[PDB]
Amino acid sequence: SLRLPQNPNAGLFKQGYNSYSNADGQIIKSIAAIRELHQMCLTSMGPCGRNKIIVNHLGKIIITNDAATMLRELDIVHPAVKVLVMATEQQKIDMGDGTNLVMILAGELLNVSEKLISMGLSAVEIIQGYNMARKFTLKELDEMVVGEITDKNDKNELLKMIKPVISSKKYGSEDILSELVSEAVSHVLPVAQQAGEIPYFNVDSIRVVKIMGGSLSNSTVIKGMVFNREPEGHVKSLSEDKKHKVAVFTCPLDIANTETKGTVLLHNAQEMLDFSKGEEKQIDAMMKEIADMGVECIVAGAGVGELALHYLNRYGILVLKVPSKFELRRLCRVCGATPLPRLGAPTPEELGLVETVKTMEIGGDRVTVFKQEQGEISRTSTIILRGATQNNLDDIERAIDDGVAAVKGLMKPSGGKLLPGAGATEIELISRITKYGERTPGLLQLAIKQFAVAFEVVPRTLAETAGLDVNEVLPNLYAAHNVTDHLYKGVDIDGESDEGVKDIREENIYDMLATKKFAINVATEAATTVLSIDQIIMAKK
Template structure:
């Protein structure tokens, strides 16, 4: 309704709400993502640096793992947070390539920023990027080398997995000990059930002290000695082929009297109750002993009475075993967790070849080795500093995930920027010949963005990036060398397949798709509405009372002017 030729002002959003929109908003979002990319890109590749991150509590983390860095960066810009999501999804889906995916997404946005500034519609850019991504993924599938035949031959299959694990480790702290850890990682993944391949069943225990090469691979389960009561030292600490019982029962005297209220009139009646409590716990302990088990484990506490009872009968016991450790013992020994001490049958017991309690560094560990079921294993990591061991664990996680994916997906591509350069070359040639309209520039921008991977690898290694990239372009476009990539040994160009720098094709496909999706999402946002917690003052010391905007809107319906 118009009053006196003037259109009344309509307040829709809460006071203090910040709104910004249009081309400037898209460019602002792109700049925020480029700031994140600038932080993380120096960690890419074999010669990438590490970041020292300190949180609000002063806890330090030294890492070059993309997913960890993105998780620890306290990013407040809403658009830049999308990069955190793609790093996490890459880590969950593949386990490696987390830095690459953020660097790629940032570079795609950087290349299309020029088109945005020139006024090209975001929808045209998004369409072009999606088309380029589809073509790139199809090209990867086309050039990828299948290892299907090698999967049937155990030796060559193992060698392929070792090469993939070694490539995943080249950019990590443990690259100097690649050979040592590669064997450990491949052994660990192959020890799992090949149907499930649940990496949670690979236990990783960290013990400060010693050198990296003092790390152990246990083909079974190892966990730190649990809290123990008097009598524990009298128990035997080593068995050969013992029977193992796993319980979810509390073996403590106090457990019974908490469960009931009893009124007594004579002292003899009270004594009968006390005797009954002792009889209950003794019956439980006797039932466990009669199973013939030599190792008793429980998720719940095993008290001092039970500990001494087992010690007198040459039985080892451990209470308060962590649930994940107990799950791995069950998987390794074939035992079944029991929630009662009665009716434990022989088939409920597990067994292992050797059980022993051993001193490792400053800790005592219980080890179950030579297990018949052995669908689990444990890596005991050693090292000088806790920060260092934590980074080794993150590095091994990436390598384990790569090997796991390689067992499922039998196709590999060359690393060292070879795959990206080949796709870039293909897209450039395709755009020149087959894309006549304005999407041609978008596809070319996408192709140019892919070159960021080899360029950043060169920059981080201190090489002449321009020179090496020019050589790579010639190799890929004119000489047809599909697997030409950055040679870190002789500072030049080499065949990545011959150098055994291999990566699963899945890593590249997932990274490209995630980076493109993130870029399209950021480009499609052209308005941000930020609701502040408290309304900003209106004029000198005046704040709009709660609900004023709604009342104003209601008032307009009754023909009232809005001031």
């Protein structure tokens, strides 16, 4: 009676494998385990949300409130959390907006199922309850859209899309950060009377170059690109040359050599005297044809030899390394030229135009300014950030990346429209799901009623992070929808929130319709997986 039988299955599989199965654990137990990381995202939600410091094993600190970024750098042993982590990764890659909503909504769907499983409801009927409730949710989101807009052009129309997204992240800045993104979108879009057929837009058209020091209000918008390099050979001519042709060369500037390793073979000394002037006049012939075409700037991705840099300095031709290939195609879109691996001679059709180039220090380090005025740019821009700390500017870049991601999600489909924010949409979905359960009798009514309860976390998080009681302002919000003016009721964050009613159209806080549709589908499937896994199999280490 001292020692246990150890079970016969101990010899089966290995000792490193761990098993969690129905009645063996899990079953709202493991659901209580993710509540530690769920509470982490609850404090980071909204404009009052709290950022979180994460120190990776490498030592780099990333301070942001984005759930997709935080869960990426964290090493988590619990496997079912990765189901929620990978669910938030899709939100950032595809749509790029609503990563905090997916983690919070999927976490509450498992919390409301705690009462369902405790009542004896099998996980088979739970999956069918959320699937039928998710289809009814997506169908009711179209009738609630008052923000349908056919413009997607004027800068003031972006105040209902880009600005509400910026309101959540770095709430301390509103008109400063919104002007940087709105002006960058106006530059990358082509100027035309009517542009149809869904003009192409990508996240690579707007870039962020972070410079230490300076106030955020001092930031501006540059149509070109700002890279940190060392100019060589001469000072720029400013506007004396006006528009100058820029030739971007993929291959470096040097006498063309074979891929195989060669060497100089000299039989007699007669070729030794001509060997010095031979390499000088050989490369000079290709460099002379470039100056005849009026090319004031040459960009060679690879390293340029000193023999090629010698000739280009006297003619006043700029040389720029651009070691990275990814940023090489970005300068080509500014001037609108074609990258040429061959040397040859520049053709007029394949050369671009740049208004002016200057070298200045924004934060004390010399950078080259590609800004082009009056010129024609296609899908290129940049945003220069000025901040005292590096970690604060990290989330600002992600806030800009999330701002331009909404433009990509707005432009690519037919449209993203608008939805009332600040807890206005989540409360309206509660009355729709609640009444939907009473229409069809059956055992699924338990899963339908609990499906609408999980929607109460979003509007109260704004009140919880504002230092308000969720037992007063939130219950009074449902009475405001009694009955248009009843769909615009929302959560108020202010010292004036005692009334708990503020018109959303005043501040114009709106959310994308396509973002909420993609966030619910991922959050519902993520919570469905946790309930659909009966047995867990682990491994050693």
